[PDB]
A and B are shown apart, each in its own frame.
Chain A
Amino acid sequence: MTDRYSFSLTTFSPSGKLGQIDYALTAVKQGVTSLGIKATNGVVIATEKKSSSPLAMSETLSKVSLLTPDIGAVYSGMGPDYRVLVDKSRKVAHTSYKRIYGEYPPTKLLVSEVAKIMQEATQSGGVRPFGVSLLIAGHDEFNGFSLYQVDPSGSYFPWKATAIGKGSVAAKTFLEKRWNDELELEDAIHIALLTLKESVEGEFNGDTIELAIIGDENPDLLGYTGIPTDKGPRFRKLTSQEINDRLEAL
């Protein structure tokens, strides 16, 4: 009863490879193409919101989620696989950083954590790895804005800009074409709009598309007043409008 599977559910191929992992990237690469761009002024990530039904209210799910007010990320993979991670991801941050450090981690460590997680999901018995990889937008003071891609392998690494999921390649291609060090976010946004529209086969609009940025600290979102030090979240999700707005900025 219980679990009698304690043994690593992925094993070294005769080639040493880990098939399930290598199978995960499949479903990972399967993911609805999601992009991210670390700009000068900030970071923006984007992906199309895939509705399985108009009855289904697309907005009611979010393929991007803030982790810390300056950090949010997107995935390509199973929405569920995306689901629980953030909870931990958010949770661990408070616990394993904030509740220690009274503040929100440098994205790197926050990144570092979930990477470790999936490795467990990789190596642990009775478990499989997750079906998502993670484009991670974050800004911390000393490390500034940060753009991180993480796999079910937990393999993680920075980007200047990037995309994952289904059509990521030609996007990244177009991105690499498009990208410069100096990309302004709206540019990058527009760029992503360009970029994502490419990977967007279905309806392309704000309601169909998910854009979030790491912007400036957002005192409008401070939700209180009278604390100078706290200037709000840097992370921001753009509106369908702001998209549809910037979709006219196309």
Chain B
Amino acid sequence: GTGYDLSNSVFSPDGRNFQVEYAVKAVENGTTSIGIKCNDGVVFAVEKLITSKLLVPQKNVKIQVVDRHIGCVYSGLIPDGRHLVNRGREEAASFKKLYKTPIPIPAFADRLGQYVQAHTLYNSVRPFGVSTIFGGVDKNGAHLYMLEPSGSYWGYKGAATGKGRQSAKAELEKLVDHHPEGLSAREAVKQAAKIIYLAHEDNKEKDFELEISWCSLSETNGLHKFVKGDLLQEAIDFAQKEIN
């Protein structure tokens, strides 16, 4: 039959939730956004779509932090992620409350997906319209994950969500091969800005702003902070030259 598509928790004859798949529709429908596990840390980058003059630039900021060491970014319903962001922002302090320690990214991870996985478990519990690039420096080094409304994330030496991923997918996979060594966050900072523009080129049609952040065990000192100002402008100019 059909209708398997309709209700979340339903296993279609193939054993599949098409809603989740439909969620993925909304997911890829998300603005292209990337993240980079770099040497000490991870770096998060996303195009900020400028729809108008009236948009106050730099105000609306897609990447959100959990604790101070966990940066997160997602393509999908901005309410979804934020909803889950706080949902995450909970668990850390929660964890950190019980365990006195800020939560390990991986620890922090599985929490989320299970929660997300809940959003699979019932036909009504509409999964989240977001897949989310997230991670940061934790007790051991950085980590970078990107989580599916399925409840699938994994370790990602780089990750990209949104439309322009494929522009990025190479770009990351490039720097994978360009830098199987590793990369300074700042170069990841630089590289990403390109990649995003490149990722943006999928979306190239309209003006956009660029949100980039990062967790550098070096620079943020095991924290997540935003790529900002000159090094931001650098990476831009870096990128905006390399886009040419």
Binding site for B on A (CB under 8 A): 1-2, 4
Pairs A–B under 8 Å by Cβ, sample size 5: A1-B122, A1-B124, A1-B125, A2-B122, A4-B124
Residues of chain A contacted by B124 (CB below 8 angstroms): 1, 4
Which residues of B are found within 8 Å of A4, using beta-carbon distances? 124
B window 13-37: CB within 8 A of A: none
The smallest C-beta distance from A205 to any residue of chain B, in angstroms, reads: 38
Interface string of B121-140 (1 = CB under 8 A from A): 01011000000000000000
Q: How far is the CB of B83 from chain A (nearest CB, A)?
A: 15
**Closest residue to B124 on the A side, CB-wise?**
A1
Proximity string of chain B (77-113) to chain A, C-beta cutoff 8 Å, 1 when within and 0 when not: 0000000000000000000000000000000000000
CB distance from A183 to the nearest CB of B (A): 49
Chain A residue with Cβ nearest B123: A4
Within 8 Å CB of B125, what residues of A? Answer: 1
123-174 of chain B: CB within 8 A of chain A: 124-125
Give bound CA distance, A4 to B9, whole Å.
13
Residues of chain B lying within 8 A (CB to CB) of residue A2: 122
Report Cα–Cα, A1/B124, bound state, in Å: 6
A4 nearest CB neighbor, chain B only: B124
State the CA gap A2–B122 with chains docked (Å): 8
Complex: A2 Cα to B124 Cα, angstroms = 9
Q: Closest approach, in angstroms, between the C-beta of B230 and any C-beta of chain A?
A: 48
Given the complex of chains A and B, what is the CA–CA distance between A2 and B121 in angstroms?
10
Once the chains are docked, how many angstroms separate the CA of A1 from the CA of B122? 6
> How near does chain A come to B61, taking the closest CB pair, in angstroms?
31
CA distance A111 to B125 in the complex (A): 39
Docked Cα-Cα span, A220 to B125, in Å, equals 56
**Complex Cα gap A102–B240 (Å):** 83
What is the distance, in angstroms, from B127's C-beta to the closest C-beta of chain A? 13
CA distance A2 to B125 in the complex (A): 9
Q: Which residues of B contact A1 (CB under 8 A)?
A: 122, 124-125
Top 5 A-B pairs, shortest CB-CB distance: A1-B125, A1-B122, A1-B124, A4-B124, A2-B122
A2's nearest neighbour on chain B, judged by CB, is B122
Closest to B118 in A: A1
The interface residues of chain A lying within 8 Å CB-to-CB of B122 are: 1-2
- How near does chain A come to B97, taking the closest CB pair, in angstroms? 26
Cα distance, A226 to B12, chains bound together (Å): 61
Nearest CB of chain B from residue A33's CB, rounded to whole Å: 31
A4 to B122, CA, bound (A): 10
- CB closest residue in chain A, given B122: A1
Chain A minimum-CB-distance residue to B121: A1
Nearest CB on B from A10, distance (A): 20
Smallest CB separation, A121 vs chain B (Å)? 20
Q: Tell me the smallest distance from the CB of A134 to a CB of chain B, in Å.
A: 30
Q: What is the CA–CA distance of A11 and B124 in the complex, to the nearest angstrom?
A: 24
A95 to chain B, nearest CB (A): 31
Report the minimal beta-carbon distance from A108 to chain B, rounded to whole angstroms: 40
Min CB distance, A115 to chain B, in Å? 31
Residues 196-219 of B at the A interface (beta carbon under 8 Å): none
B128 CB, nearest partner CB in chain A, Å? 14
Say how far B59's CB is from chain A's closest CB, in angstroms.
34
CA distance A15 to B124 in the complex (A): 33
